[PDB]
Amino acid sequence: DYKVADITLAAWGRRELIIAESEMPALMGLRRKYAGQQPLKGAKILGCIHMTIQTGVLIETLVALGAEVRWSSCNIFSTQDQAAAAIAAAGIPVFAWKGETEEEYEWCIEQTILKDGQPWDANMVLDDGGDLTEILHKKYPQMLERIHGITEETTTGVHRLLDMLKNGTLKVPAINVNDSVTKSKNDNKYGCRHSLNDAIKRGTDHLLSGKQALVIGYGDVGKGSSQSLRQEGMIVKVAEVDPICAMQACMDGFEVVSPYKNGINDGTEASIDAALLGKIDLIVTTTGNVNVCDANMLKALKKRAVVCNIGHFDNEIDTAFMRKNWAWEEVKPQVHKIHRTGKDGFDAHNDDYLILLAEGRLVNLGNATGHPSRIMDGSFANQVLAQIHLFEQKYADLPAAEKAKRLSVEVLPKKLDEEVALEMVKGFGGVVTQLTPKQAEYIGVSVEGPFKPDTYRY
Amino acid sequence: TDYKVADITLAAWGRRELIIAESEMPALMGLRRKYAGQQPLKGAKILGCIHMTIQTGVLIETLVALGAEVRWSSCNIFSTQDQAAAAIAAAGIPVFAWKGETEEEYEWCIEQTILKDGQPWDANMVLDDGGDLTEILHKKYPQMLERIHGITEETTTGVHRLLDMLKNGTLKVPAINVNDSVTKSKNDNKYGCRHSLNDAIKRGTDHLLSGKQALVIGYGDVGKGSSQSLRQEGMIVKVAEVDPICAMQACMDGFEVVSPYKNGINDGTEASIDAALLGKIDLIVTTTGNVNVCDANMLKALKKRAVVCNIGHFDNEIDTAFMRKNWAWEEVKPQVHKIHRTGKDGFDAHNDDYLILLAEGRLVNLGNATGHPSRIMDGSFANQVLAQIHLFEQKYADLPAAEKAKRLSVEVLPKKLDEEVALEMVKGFGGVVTQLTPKQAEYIGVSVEGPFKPDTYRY
Amino acid sequence: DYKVADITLAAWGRRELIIAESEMPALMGLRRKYAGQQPLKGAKILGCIHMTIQTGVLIETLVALGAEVRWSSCNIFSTQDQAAAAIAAAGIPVFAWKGETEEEYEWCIEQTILKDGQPWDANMVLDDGGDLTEILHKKYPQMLERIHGITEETTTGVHRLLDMLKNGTLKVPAINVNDSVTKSKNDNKYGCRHSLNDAIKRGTDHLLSGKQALVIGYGDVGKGSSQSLRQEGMIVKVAEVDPICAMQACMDGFEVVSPYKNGINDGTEASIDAALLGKIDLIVTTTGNVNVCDANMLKALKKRAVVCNIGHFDNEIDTAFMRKNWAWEEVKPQVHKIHRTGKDGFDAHNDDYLILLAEGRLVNLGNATGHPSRIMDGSFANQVLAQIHLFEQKYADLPAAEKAKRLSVEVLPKKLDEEVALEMVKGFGGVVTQLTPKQAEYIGVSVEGPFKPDTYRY
Amino acid sequence: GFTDYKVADITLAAWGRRELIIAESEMPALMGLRRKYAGQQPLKGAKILGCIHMTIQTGVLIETLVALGAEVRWSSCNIFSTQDQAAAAIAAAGIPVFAWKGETEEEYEWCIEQTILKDGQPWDANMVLDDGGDLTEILHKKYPQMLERIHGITEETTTGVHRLLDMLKNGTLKVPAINVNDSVTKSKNDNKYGCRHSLNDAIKRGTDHLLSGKQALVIGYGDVGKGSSQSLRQEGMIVKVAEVDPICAMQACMDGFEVVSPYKNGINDGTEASIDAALLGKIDLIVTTTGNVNVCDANMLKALKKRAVVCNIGHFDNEIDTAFMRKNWAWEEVKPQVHKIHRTGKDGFDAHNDDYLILLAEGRLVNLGNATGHPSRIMDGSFANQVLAQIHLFEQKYADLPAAEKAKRLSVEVLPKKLDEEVALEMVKGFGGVVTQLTPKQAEYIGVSVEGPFKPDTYRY
Numbered sequence A, C: 001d002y003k004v005a006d007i008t009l010a011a012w013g014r015r016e017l018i019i020a021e022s023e024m025p026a027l028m029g030l031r032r033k034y035a036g037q038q039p040l041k042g043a044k045i046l047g048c049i050h051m052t053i054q055t056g057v058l059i060e061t062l063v064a065l066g067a068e069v070r071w072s073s074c075n076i077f078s079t080q081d082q083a084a085a086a087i088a089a090a091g092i093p094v095f096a097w098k099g100e101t102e103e104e105y106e107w108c109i110e111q112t113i114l115k116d117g118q119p120w121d122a123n124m125v126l127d128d129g130g131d132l133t134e135i136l137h138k139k140y141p142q143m144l145e146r147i148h149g150i151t152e153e154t155t156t157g158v159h160r161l162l163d164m165l166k167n168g169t170l171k172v173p174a175i176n177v178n179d180s181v182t183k184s185k186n187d188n189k190y191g192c193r194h195s196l197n198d199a200i201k202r203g204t205d206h207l208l209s210g211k212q213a214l215v216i217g218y219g220d221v222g223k224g225s226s227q228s229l230r231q232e233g234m235i236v237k238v239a240e241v242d243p244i245c246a247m248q249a250c251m252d253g254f255e256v257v258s259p260y261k262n263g264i265n266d267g268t269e270a271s272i273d274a275a276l277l278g279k280i281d282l283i284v285t286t287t288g289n290v291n292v293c294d295a296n297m298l299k300a301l302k303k304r305a306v307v308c309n310i311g312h313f314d315n316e317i318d319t320a321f322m323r324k325n326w327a328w329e330e331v332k333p334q335v336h337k338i339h340r341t342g343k344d345g346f347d348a349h350n351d352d353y354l355i356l357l358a359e360g361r362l363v364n365l366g367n368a369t370g371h372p373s374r375i376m377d378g379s380f381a382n383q384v385l386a387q388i389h390l391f392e393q394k395y396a397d398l399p400a401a402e403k404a405k406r407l408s409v410e411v412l413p414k415k416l417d418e419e420v421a422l423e424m425v426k427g428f429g430g431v432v433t434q435l436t437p438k439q440a441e442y443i444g445v446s447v448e449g450p451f452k453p454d455t456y457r458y
Numbered sequence B: 001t002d003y004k005v006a007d008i009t010l011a012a013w014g015r016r017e018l019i020i021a022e023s024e025m026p027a028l029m030g031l032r033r034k035y036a037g038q039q040p041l042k043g044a045k046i047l048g049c050i051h052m053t054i055q056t057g058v059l060i061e062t063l064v065a066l067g068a069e070v071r072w073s074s075c076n077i078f079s080t081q082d083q084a085a086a087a088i089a090a091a092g093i094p095v096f097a098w099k100g101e102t103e104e105e106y107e108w109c110i111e112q113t114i115l116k117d118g119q120p121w122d123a124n125m126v127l128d129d130g131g132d133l134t135e136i137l138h139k140k141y142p143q144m145l146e147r148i149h150g151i152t153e154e155t156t157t158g159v160h161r162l163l164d165m166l167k168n169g170t171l172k173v174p175a176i177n178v179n180d181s182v183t184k185s186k187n188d189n190k191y192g193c194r195h196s197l198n199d200a201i202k203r204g205t206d207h208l209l210s211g212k213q214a215l216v217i218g219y220g221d222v223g224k225g226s227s228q229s230l231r232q233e234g235m236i237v238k239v240a241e242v243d244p245i246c247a248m249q250a251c252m253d254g255f256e257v258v259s260p261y262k263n264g265i266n267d268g269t270e271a272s273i274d275a276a277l278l279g280k281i282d283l284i285v286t287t288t289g290n291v292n293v294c295d296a297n298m299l300k301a302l303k304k305r306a307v308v309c310n311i312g313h314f315d316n317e318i319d320t321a322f323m324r325k326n327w328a329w330e331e332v333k334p335q336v337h338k339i340h341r342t343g344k345d346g347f348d349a350h351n352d353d354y355l356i357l358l359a360e361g362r363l364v365n366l367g368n369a370t371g372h373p374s375r376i377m378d379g380s381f382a383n384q385v386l387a388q389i390h391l392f393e394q395k396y397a398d399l400p401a402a403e404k405a406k407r408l409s410v411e412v413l414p415k416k417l418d419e420e421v422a423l424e425m426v427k428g429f430g431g432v433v434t435q436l437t438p439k440q441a442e443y444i445g446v447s448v449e450g451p452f453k454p455d456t457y458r459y
Numbered sequence D: 001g002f003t004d005y006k007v008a009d010i011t012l013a014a015w016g017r018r019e020l021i022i023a024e025s026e027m028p029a030l031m032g033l034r035r036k037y038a039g040q041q042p043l044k045g046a047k048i049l050g051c052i053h054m055t056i057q058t059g060v061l062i063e064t065l066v067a068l069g070a071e072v073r074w075s076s077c078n079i080f081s082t083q084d085q086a087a088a089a090i091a092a093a094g095i096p097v098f099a100w101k102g103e104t105e106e107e108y109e110w111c112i113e114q115t116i117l118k119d120g121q122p123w124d125a126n127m128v129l130d131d132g133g134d135l136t137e138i139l140h141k142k143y144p145q146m147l148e149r150i151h152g153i154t155e156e157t158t159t160g161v162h163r164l165l166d167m168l169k170n171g172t173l174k175v176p177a178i179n180v181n182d183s184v185t186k187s188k189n190d191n192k193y194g195c196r197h198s199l200n201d202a203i204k205r206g207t208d209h210l211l212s213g214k215q216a217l218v219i220g221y222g223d224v225g226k227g228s229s230q231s232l233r234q235e236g237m238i239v240k241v242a243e244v245d246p247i248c249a250m251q252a253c254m255d256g257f258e259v260v261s262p263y264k265n266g267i268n269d270g271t272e273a274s275i276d277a278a279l280l281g282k283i284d285l286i287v288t289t290t291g292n293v294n295v296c297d298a299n300m301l302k303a304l305k306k307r308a309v310v311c312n313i314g315h316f317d318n319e320i321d322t323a324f325m326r327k328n329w330a331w332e333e334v335k336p337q338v339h340k341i342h343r344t345g346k347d348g349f350d351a352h353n354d355d356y357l358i359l360l361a362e363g364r365l366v367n368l369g370n371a372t373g374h375p376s377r378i379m380d381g382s383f384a385n386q387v388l389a390q391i392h393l394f395e396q397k398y399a400d401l402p403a404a405e406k407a408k409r410l411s412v413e414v415l416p417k418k419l420d421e422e423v424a425l426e427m428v429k430g431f432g433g434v435v436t437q438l439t440p441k442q443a444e445y446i447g448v449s450v451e452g453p454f455k456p457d458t459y460r461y
């Protein structure tokens, strides 16, 4: 009962799992610590995390505690066929597949909900994009009563869930595991300072030392990425709208500049400050806004400059005017060449042009695999610990006199994160000093924890 | 004028330092200019207890220029600078502080701060850093407490005392957590220690740091600042922590996590200490703020001629009381001591079995140096001033009994004021911020002018 | 005739040659300067450096002045198929492809000398490593009558030239281009620094922030490698045999240790500091010596360790040990898994293996592309200058009386290198101040002549 | 005899002596020579003249010289570079010295003359140890009669080396001299890392200014220039480099710096129109590391941004135009070694001026003026090399040789590399590092004896 295209590729995926499993000591520590206790015995879960080589390890930890899972996908493209087949090669049925059919990933989801005609006894839901949440709440209202908790990991998907609580029909407590410190720090400031320079140097094979680059935004992603260039000898300037992030940039050794004169964006050609644009060799966008690099900027920029993007959306740079006015030429599968001569008819070589690296999209995926396995360790143990927490309280088994008391969406409490951090530190080989009772009394916390309040920003 | 300073001749030098320092702190000068006509502190009375360096003088002077009259003393024994005290006292302003005092003189400073001519001062707010002055007010003189509108706290260890008194209801007047603003926690705790730590070490020991090995205890904000101050000079740094989150961050920043005790278990016996690791470290810095984090049995197993100093706010992190009973002390120079091991009655003048200790385990950046640059103190003194502005308008003591029941709590400053302070800080460096267009602001769900981040944002 | 992997990549190649032409201002300036006179009319060159994009640009510059060239691969895993095909499309026979074999590596050199069944009338020589020079000097010395000079790129070559000069078996003058400042303090120091971590990531996909490494040797290449591994958050230590280099490393912020107790190496298993090797994760050797990593340290290394090497010859690591007692498994090109159990057989579930990069040869070229264009520009400008200088003398057409006075190893003067440095500076947009007559008189040099004396170490 | 000294005072000896006894553990190489050569005393009968800044480390060097059987007299190389405590400590030990702080050039010349003149009569010296060639040039100028008995001279700085080279080129030098600046453990150790260690400390303790987010301009990219540029960056500073040498500019560009010129296109003519006034209007800190003349002209201090900091790290003061300052603008002091320069005029002074200028150490050495110089572990190698050079040259006996052989012994030479390796090896062991030793196979393959030296004479490191 599998839809995976090719099942014979399991051994390749098996050894890829084996090499990938070693670099994720968190899940190994969770498997060792809770072995023999079996805290997930009798649990039935259905979920749709994006299928990759690490996702196959994530399922392996869950089944090690005695759970039964049926699997699907949250998108169309993020699914490695050989790894999914390797999971299918075991006793776990899987349905994720790279069929490239947008009208067919919905029908794949329908098979996990119902085994054969009759619906399945679902206790926990491990959602990624929130579409499973909506399909359960809309098409099968009767199954929701036997659900203990759901788990969501995405951006602005929790935003939809929070508002749906106010509008009613949400009868199950939910966890906002996205706000974990470990996962937040691993996702933004660490996975970037390792992959930005690698993707750039793979795409262009240029030399960075001595050149000048401009960075838009100094948020989490912008700070994590701004230090991948200054450590290479580049001279870096920062652009921002939030004064506090600008102050942090000033105190960190950078310089803050504005593309428009006086920072005012009037829209006329007189607003563009061409003086500073005649010395720039590279522009990066780290913000999540829209049209932060407009059409007027790209005319006044210095020749042969490079262009790239890190934000999730693609409308940071005015690609519509660029496609409407200037012609494109391809250098290699993911590098493009755009001239400013005219609509068509460029020479073999020219002196007036620019360069794009990901046709205005996410550079981390176009040029490279993405984050490594070590960094993505934290984001996958939070899910498991949260399932542990929600499986024991048994919301669905409680009578109606306390449904209103326990019906809310919350975040993961501080204690469970520290366990993951301790396991990760033990992965590196570090050692932690246990507190004597006198010192714990002096600082007024328990020996086991927690060590910090909820108003603390690490 | 209450003349009590070590020397008075040093006023002019402090005056020139004050003139130069004003050009350094632009946000505070701009606040003074903008709030010059409103006089939002008309009739405000303050008590002051903070480090008496040259930066605090401009804050005191703007407080005076905004219609407030105040009294001051030093938070710590080794904090005052004589030129600043002389220059400020030359302006007809009472103050009581100098450098190198004793514990009895230290407490006499507070008892002079809160008393005048045998009668209690008619103070309406209190400014405290350290929490000792609050304890003196609360314990011995409860009769003046109800006349208080609020108190400002400058450091974390004071906030701990405020919270523990709030838990048992001993706190009777509300307080503002000044130490919580983003322009405070991510500026003073981190960047200033980074600028100041190596300066004090060099001014005290003159030792070369490149190629040596050091151990830093704790990885909070002060720990991060210290690690940055040390590694940038070319050292080999190791960090010890009790919070797993901070250990993970230390592993992420490129440092190593080690524990002096075997298996991280403090057994207390002389055997549990991992003497192999301590037989290589040349410098120890304590950042935790806990008590007795530097055990007596670890000090006996260190390398000869090792350096010991403290950056925390208390002197209980190092077992300096154990040394004073068993080992002999000789003074190299002011604030520098050689402690010879294995003996008390005397020391061989050429003996090599000794240690060097700086500032007797107290604050190291203040006792041995000047502390922080004014460019850093500006971002804190602005929040202090604004918090006092907000606090004075409440007039807590004049509310009816019912209102006081729902007004006794702790809280923070709004984000808009902090963003204004940051904006005025940035422009001093010569930078330019870009303003949004209405379409972008409506896209990100934010106004053109106002807060840009939600409350749960960790920055 | 020729043999390359494929030729259809000539369009993409030519696009990359055009884009790389813009990042080498010095070579463009010299090609513009000498195109109108062609000093190399009739000059014939037989070169054997690495065949890459820069090398193709160098060949184009050589043929732009009227020369005739032939080429072959310098290392077994260094050539680029696209660049070789693009140059072969220009009318120059070339023999180089990836995945070559040691016996087949000799095949390339044998036919670059022979033309249509006869040896060719080569006049000048370019080599990188001295492997072709020994073949020339060892089998048939009848070529050296008409050869005007020999040029060497690397330090090992110069060592071999001097070792031959000790015996007096050398018969042709050589001009040293290695010891030029614009080459020694640029190529070794900055190319390896800019490329080593990228080559590591292109093949490991690990997280380098929070690991342990050891780098052996602290030369210019060693300094570059140590600075390269610093910026990735790694923890590194330096082992040296030279007191001065050890002092410099100690002053740079490293820990200096040796894998031997008190430094004494005798061969017994009891002479190895087993504790230190039990926690190291990555090892890189940058020495140029023999038996730098003996057999006994490979037995006492920590599980799951990565082995790296950027030496020209494969004598740093005792590979015969593995080939005679251990078994290898390949996960992907230029990466193998070497188990420490036996050569008979193994299982995938074991954890007693080692990870090796590029089978122990140069990983800068084996696992990556190599140096960028802007770094090779400075080397190729000096190469072209020395190439033009030596031909004008016409050594091979002189009587023995003047032949006696010319057998010598010479270098380029100081003044010529300063022009190349000036051209490289203006590529970044910088401006160099001009000395006034008074200042020039006071210092003791002419207003525009060489400024530093011959003994300056820089 | 010993009584005739002149220092700040006496009482600082007890504390100074503690500083020396602390420093003895910080300099292993010098103590290694002290232990090795004290049993045979190869310096007996030497009468050494000396001129280098008086500090703690130089006091330990003087103690090392006496421990081998020397009779030395010492003085000041720089006007502001003395230390009171070490000067008091050495004086009470029986070795006469003449050095204090905040003197005038008359007193400086008086001390220089008095060091070489004993009881009104020229002193029958056999050795000279100068720094900068001042004392060496005096003898060729006023006392030509001392040079028939003087065995040799030693030189420490680059400017002194250049002066001796010019003297030899003109054919007026009389006595052979050895330059110790060219040794690897001197050129690539003292000039670079010590300037790195001591640059920002002087700024930090002279002005107490934050260095994050500021802009500075470093002129010159020698060894000292490289060290200073590396010292400024590590504090979080955006700094710029200018030069006249293309190769060093290429190195600076590769390092991660921007190369600009303080003139419109690099051509200077003395006209104000040639100044790149836009760039100089936003620069806060200036450092000159050239040793040339007039690298900071009047039109740079007439066009700089207000409230900027000015410094010099080269040997001599003429590198910047102080003479313009002394007669066009007014001066006022805030603290010792710090000043205020006002561009409004030489009168009309008022404390609330907003376009003032700040100058550090009056254009002399700032690492030794506003700070206490390099640490002991760096000066260890330089002093060990100096004492080794003195020991080696004392064994040749140039004065007593016949004039026929004297013609072939007049040159400027450098020490053999084996002594450099000995110094470096004993320096390393003060850190804890362990140096590997070669097996016969590796020694034969490399082609170098197991005992050193392992590198040719053309290596640059």
Ligand SMILES: NC(=O)c1ccc[n+]([C@@H]2O[C@H](COP(=O)([O-])OP(=O)(O)OC[C@H]3O[C@@H](n4cnc5c(N)ncnc54)[C@H](O)[C@@H]3O)[C@@H](O)[C@H]2O)c1
Pocket: A187, A188, A191, A216, A217, A218, A219, A220, A221, A222, A239, A240, A241, A242, A245, A286, A287, A288, A289, A292, A310, A311, A312, A313, A362, A364, B434, B436, B440, B452
């Ligand atoms: N792995 C990845 O590539 C990855 C991961 C998570 C998020 N992201 C994306 O990165 C973007 C931001 O990430 P973040 O966590 O740093 O966000 P953030 O919440 O920290 O905000 C980004 C910053 O951009 C600033 N900004 C907004 N408009 C601007 C403008 N007009 N000019 C200059 N600065 C402006 C904001 O003030 C903020 O400081 C989003 O699009 C997010 O989806 C990427």
Ligand SMILES: NC(=O)c1ccc[n+]([C@@H]2O[C@H](COP(=O)([O-])OP(=O)(O)OC[C@H]3O[C@@H](n4cnc5c(N)ncnc54)[C@H](O)[C@@H]3O)[C@@H](O)[C@H]2O)c1
Pocket: A433, A439, A451, B155, B156, B157, B158, B188, B189, B193, B217, B218, B219, B220, B221, B222, B223, B240, B241, B242, B243, B246, B287, B288, B289, B290, B293, B311, B312, B313, B314, B363, B365
């Ligand atoms: N000198 C200064 O400039 C300065 C400035 C601000 C605060 N302080 C003082 O420093 C102290 C601590 O600084 P903070 O409050 O900013 O830091 P912090 O609140 O972030 O916590 C200090 C760190 O020490 C750790 N720690 C506690 N006990 C430990 C133990 N036994 N072993 C190892 N680690 C342990 C904690 O987990 C925490 O990470 C306070 O008393 C504060 O008042 C000094």
Ligand SMILES: NC(=O)c1ccc[n+]([C@@H]2O[C@H](COP(=O)([O-])OP(=O)(O)OC[C@H]3O[C@@H](n4cnc5c(N)ncnc54)[C@H](O)[C@@H]3O)[C@@H](O)[C@H]2O)c1
Pocket: C154, C155, C156, C188, C192, C216, C217, C218, C219, C220, C221, C222, C239, C240, C241, C242, C245, C286, C287, C288, C289, C292, C310, C311, C312, C313, C362, C364, D436, D442, D454
């Ligand atoms: N990978 C590349 O891109 C590249 C480029 C050029 C040269 N190389 C090769 O690298 C090698 C060395 O490079 P280099 O020119 O910088 O060398 P180098 O001449 O500058 O010296 C190498 C260093 O290794 C040290 N060393 C020698 N034997 C040692 C031992 N047994 N233990 C420890 N240290 C030892 C030496 O003292 C020296 O400091 C040569 O074989 C050269 O051909 C590699």
Ligand SMILES: NC(=O)c1ccc[n+]([C@@H]2O[C@H](COP(=O)([O-])OP(=O)(O)OC[C@H]3O[C@@H](n4cnc5c(N)ncnc54)[C@H](O)[C@@H]3O)[C@@H](O)[C@H]2O)c1
Pocket: C433, C439, C451, D157, D158, D159, D190, D191, D195, D219, D220, D221, D222, D223, D224, D225, D242, D243, D244, D245, D248, D289, D290, D291, D292, D294, D295, D313, D314, D315, D316, D365, D366, D367, D368
């Ligand atoms: N303060 C200290 O502790 C200390 C220590 C050692 C040396 N020094 C002094 O430093 C000085 C020089 O040091 P060094 O030996 O590294 O010098 P250096 O000779 O090695 O380099 C001087 C640099 O100045 C540049 N230069 C010269 N004139 C210039 C001009 N007009 N404009 C721009 N650049 C110009 C040259 O191109 C060169 O790069 C000497 O006078 C020496 O006495 C001071």
Ligand SMILES: Nc1ncnc2c1ncn2[C@@H]1O[C@H](CO)[C@@H](O)[C@H]1O
Pocket: B050, B051, B053, B055, B056, B129, B154, B155, B188, B189, B192, B313, B366, B370, B371, B372, B377
């Ligand atoms: N020189 C100084 N002037 C004023 N406040 C200081 C100084 N040094 C430290 N502080 C502050 O005093 C507190 C010490 O714990 C912190 O808030 C720290 O930022």
Ligand SMILES: [K+]
Pocket: B053, B054, B055, B370, B371, B372, B373, B374, D208
């Ligand atoms: K200060």
Ligand SMILES: [K+]
Pocket: C052, C053, C054, C369, C370, C371, C372
């Ligand atoms: K290439």
Ligand SMILES: [K+]
Pocket: B206, D372, D373, D374, D375, D376
């Ligand atoms: K010193």
